[PDB]
C-alpha cells in the first residue's frame, strides 16, 4: 500500500490508501498489459488461526467466499474540527496501519504537535499476536523501555513503520492555510 491525501479550496478532502498488498503484490504481471497483480487474497484468513503476511489471524468472519472482499487494515482518515477539515491522514503498513494512523492523530490532538512533528515522532505497535511491543530504532529511551519491560512487555526493535502523507488545515483570518508532511521513514 501507499497513502495519499488531498484537500482543496472549497473544503473537500479525499483520503486514499490503495495497494497491491505485498511489495510488488503477487510479483506476477499480466502479459501484454504491463501491470502487477495484487496478492490481496492473503488478506483473507485462508485457514482458521493461520497467521498471514502481517501476523493477522481469523476464523469465519474473514474466511474466503466468492466475490467477498478480503478484510483490510487500511485507515484513510479525515479529522474535522468544528466541522471543518483539520487532518487528512493515512499510511501503509499492513497490520501496522491502524496504530500508525492513530498515533499521528494522538500526537496532534493530545500533544499539540504540528503535522510534521506528529509524522516524524517515533511509533510503537501492539497487535496482540505476536505478543510483543514493537518499536523503532532510536524511538524509545532506556528509561521508558525499562519501565515498560517491568509492566511485562516484550519489547522488540524492528524496521520503521509506515509512510504517512498527511495534511493539516488551519483557519487563517481569511481562508485556510494547508500544511503537508511526507514521512522521513520513506
Amino acid at each position: 500500500a501507499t497513502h495519499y491525501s488531498v484537500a482543496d479550496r472549497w473544503g473537500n478532502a479525499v483520503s486514499v490508501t490503495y495497494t497491491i498488498n505485498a511489495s510488488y503484490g503477487s510479483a506476477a504481471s499480466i502479459d501484454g498489459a504491463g501491470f502487477l497483480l495484487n496478492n490481496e487474497m492473503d488478506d483473507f484468513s485462508i485457514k482458521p488461526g493461520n497467521p498471514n503476511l502481517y501476523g493477522l489471524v481469523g476464523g469465519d468472519a474473514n474466511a474466503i467466499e466468492a466475490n467477498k472482499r478480503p478484510l483490510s487494515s487500511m485507515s484513510p482518515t479525515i479529522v474535522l474540527k468544528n466541522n471543518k477539515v483539520f487532518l487528512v491522514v493515512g499510511s501503509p503498513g499492513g497490520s501496522r496501519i491502524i496504530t500508525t494512523v492513530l498515533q499521528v492523530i494522538s500526537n496532534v490532538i493530545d500533544y499539540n504537535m504540528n503535522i510534521s512533528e506528529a509524522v516524524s515522532a517515533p511509533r510503537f505497535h501492539m497487535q496482540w499476536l505476536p505478543d510483543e511491543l514493537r518499536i523503532e530504532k532510536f524511538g524509545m529511551p532506556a528509561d521508558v523501555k525499562d519501565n515498560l519491560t517491568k509492566m511485562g512487555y516484550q519489547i522488540v526493535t524492528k524496521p520503521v513503520m509506515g509512510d504517512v502523507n498527511a495534511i493539516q488545515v488551519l483557519p487563517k483570518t481569511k481562508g485556510s492555510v494547508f500544511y503537508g508532511s511526507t514521512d522521513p521513514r520513506k
Partner: protein, 348 residues
Amino acid sequence: IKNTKVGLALSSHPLASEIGQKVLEEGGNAIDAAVAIGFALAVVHPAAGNIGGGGFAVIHLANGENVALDFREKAPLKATKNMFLDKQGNVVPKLSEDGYLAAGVPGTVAGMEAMLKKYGTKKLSQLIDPAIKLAENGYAISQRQAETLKEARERFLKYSSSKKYFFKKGHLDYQEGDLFVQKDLAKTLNQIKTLGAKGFYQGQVAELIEKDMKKNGGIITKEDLASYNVKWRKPVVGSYRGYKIISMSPPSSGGTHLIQILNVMENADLSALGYGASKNIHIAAEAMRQAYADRSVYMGDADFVSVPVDKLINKAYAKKIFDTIQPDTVTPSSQIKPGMGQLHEGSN
C-alpha cells in the same frame, strides 16, 4: 510543505504529488486531483501504486457530507473457502502470496472512475495524460526503488511477464538513475483514457487478463472483470476530545479499530504526561491488544458476515476496556478474550 490557494495533494512519490498539485492549480477539485495521483502512482511507484489492486477513499464534501468508496478487490467468482489448502487441510506454501491465484479482482480502475463520475469536475482523458506520459517516456529509478526491486528479484523470476517488465535485458536489476519505461502499461492506460473503466474490465485488456490467468493457473476470467463493482458506503465515524474522526468502514477493519482504540485512550489524560511517557504508551498498547483480539473474530466483509461495528466503536465498550487495564501491568495476549464478553448476541 504549505499552500494557501488551491490546497495540497501529497503522496509518496514527488512526480505523482506534482501531478495532483497541478490539477488543483488548474481548477480541479480534491476528487479530480485524487484521480490523477492514483494513475500516476500506478506508473512511478509500482511496488504499491497500481492498477492491478484496490483500495478505499474516504471523502469529506464541501456540503458537509461524508462518504466512503470501497474499491477493494473481490475474491473471484470461483473462489472457495479452502482454495489455498492441500488435501490434508494444511496451507499450500506461497499459494496465497505469489502468482496468479493470489490475486483478487482489481478495483483501482473502477474506483478512480466511480469517484470521478460522482464527485469530480474534470474528464478522465485530462487526468490520465500525465501518467501515460510517464509510462511512455519513462522516469529515473530511485535509490529506494533499486533496493525494493532487488529484494523482489526471486519473486519476479518465477513469472515470464515480470521478468520482461521489471528487469533490463539479460534479467538484470534496475539500478538507481536508470530510465524505466513501461510501454505495455502505457497501452493499458491509453485504453482507459479512451473507454474509461470499460477499457480495463472489458475488451482487449480483459482478454489479456483472462488469457494470462488461464495460462498461469489463475481463476479470474472476463466474467469476474465484468462483475467487478465498487460500493459507496457510510464511513465509520467517532469523536476524540471534541474532534470528529471519519474513517474507513468494513471491508476495512481500520476505521473501526482506530476509533475504538482512541475511544479507550480518551479515558486517560494523555496530555498530562506528554509524548512518549510509558504510562501513556501502556494505555494505548493495551487498547491495541484488545482491539486486535476483537479484529480476529468480529471483522470481515460486512456484506457477507455480521460485523458489530456500532458495538466496537461504542464509547461504553471502550470504557469497559479501559477499566480492564491494570495499572503498571500488562494482560498477556493469552488471557485476552475477543469481545470481552460484550459482543455475544446470545449463543451465536
